[PDB]
Amino acid sequence: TSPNSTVRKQAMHSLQVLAQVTGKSVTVIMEPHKEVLQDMVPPKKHLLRHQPANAQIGLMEGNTFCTTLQPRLFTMDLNVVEHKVFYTELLNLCEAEDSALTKLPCYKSLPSLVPLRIAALNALAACNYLPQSREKIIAALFKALNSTNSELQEAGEACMRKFLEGATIEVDQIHTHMRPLLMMLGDYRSLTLNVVNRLTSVTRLFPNSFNDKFCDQMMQHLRKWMEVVVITHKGGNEMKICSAIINLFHLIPAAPQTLVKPLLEVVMKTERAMLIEAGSPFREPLIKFLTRHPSQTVELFMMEATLNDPQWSRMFMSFLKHKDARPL
């Protein structure tokens, strides 16, 4: 529970090393000592609001560590007053606005709340075994997963991955929590890089969520974004938007093989307009998608007319030379 992040992480790593060398588990090693944690896991004698931010993060990380062990060293029970207080503080920290935290004196001087929010989210995701909590925890995890902050988004994805290891989540819950984002992406201008990153995280965690019609909508949006990229190039983040959208396809299991032809056509059109082959950032995600349907790609490229057309032949040769193109 040390406030010093280096010493805390080295102690946790040291306990894991000791468990690996001895062959015992971390819980067995920590079990006779755990008396020394009784005041800290969960924090009893002080409210976290009174404690400095570094101490708060250290206590939350220590709680996450003790609760994440395979046999839990401490099991939180919401019937215990201190445990409910700690859980409520974690929920408030995850849910509250940045301005509501800033007015609190302990946070008032942090350069960024984001490390505190990540530590709180990790401490909340560790409570996957309490059946009463799950709805609020899932709501907080989805709020973090939908955060415009990149670091908070990645932390939300990781915490959701950690939470799903010990708790189920229903498809209805996913659809209800993701409905605000899915409704907004009807127009192509709404597809910022953050939105596509959030969709990527959702499809990584929950592959079932997205179906064929979503892939068609993403294809239409990608066509419009590639047209915008070409217009911008002719006039002189859209390239990253395009690349992320293409990368989204190979992570959706419901993406049909029929997408290969329009995807190749739009990438070829954009590259020909921009006159780029080596510097094209569309090849890396496209080859990931093509390797998922290698027979369709080979049959499309190995057509006589397509092998005569020098541009398509060049694109085929470039794909076949790639490291990931073993299926092709």
Is 205:252 a contact under the CB 8 Å cutoff?
A: no
Q: Report residue 168 as tokens.
A: 């189920």
Q: Report residue 211 as tokens.
A: 């179906």
Report, in angstroms and rounded to the nearest whole number, the Rg of the chain calculated over CA atoms: 25
d(CA 112, CA 50): 18
The rounded Cα 148 to chain-centroid distance in angstroms is 12
Is 128:161 a contact under the CB 8 Å cutoff?
A: no
CA distances from 125 to 16, 26, 42, 117, 197 (A): 21, 20, 15, 12, 21
d(CA 289, CA 262): 12
Closest CA to 276 of 227, 233, 313, 308: 233
Helix (H, G, I), strand (E, B) or coil at 132: coil
Please give the DSSP secondary-structure letter assigned to residue 42.
Answer: T
d(CA 180, CA 195): 11
d(CA 223, CA 81): 56
Please give the DSSP secondary-structure letter assigned to residue 258.
Answer: G
Please give the DSSP secondary-structure letter assigned to residue 149.
Answer: S
Experiment used for this model: cryo-EM
Is 182:146 a contact under the CB 8 Å cutoff?
A: no
d(CA 71, CA 31): 11
Task: Write b or e for each residue in 118-143: b if 16 or more Cβ atoms lie within 10 A of its Cβ, otherwise e.
Answer: bbbbbbbbbbbebeebbebbbbbbbe
Query: Tell me, what amino acid is at 218?
Result: M
Is 139:177 a contact under the CB 8 Å cutoff?
A: yes
Is 218:289 a contact under the CB 8 Å cutoff?
A: no
Is 191:245 a contact under the CB 8 Å cutoff?
A: yes
d(CA 221, CA 157): 24
Please give the DSSP secondary-structure letter assigned to residue 34.
Answer: G
Per the rule left: phi > 0, alpha: psi between -120 and 50, beta: everything else, 37 is: alpha
Count the Cβ atoms, other than its own, within 10 Å of residue 149.
Answer: 17
Closest CA to 137 of 114, 166, 116, 113: 166
Listed as own residue / partner, the contacts of 8-13 with beta carbons closer than 8 Å and 24 or more positions apart are 8/58, 8/61, 8/62, 12/65
The strand ranges marked E within 20-75 are: none
Resolution of the entry in angstroms: 3.0
The H or E element that residue 220 is part of is helix 212-235
Query: Sign (positive/negative) of CA torsion 218, 224, 226, 228?
Result: negative
CA distances from 294 to 4, 287, 302, 315, 323 (A): 51, 10, 12, 15, 14
Query: Sign (positive/negative) of CA torsion 201, 202, 204, 210?
Result: negative
Helix (H, G, I), strand (E, B) or coil at 7: helix
Closest CA to 122 of 178, 173, 161: 161
Query: Tell me, what amino acid is at 311?
Result: Q
d(CA 175, CA 173): 5
The strand ranges marked E within the chain are: none
d(CA 320, CA 311): 14
Is 143:96 a contact under the CB 8 Å cutoff?
A: no
Query: Tell me, what amino acid is at 201?
Result: S
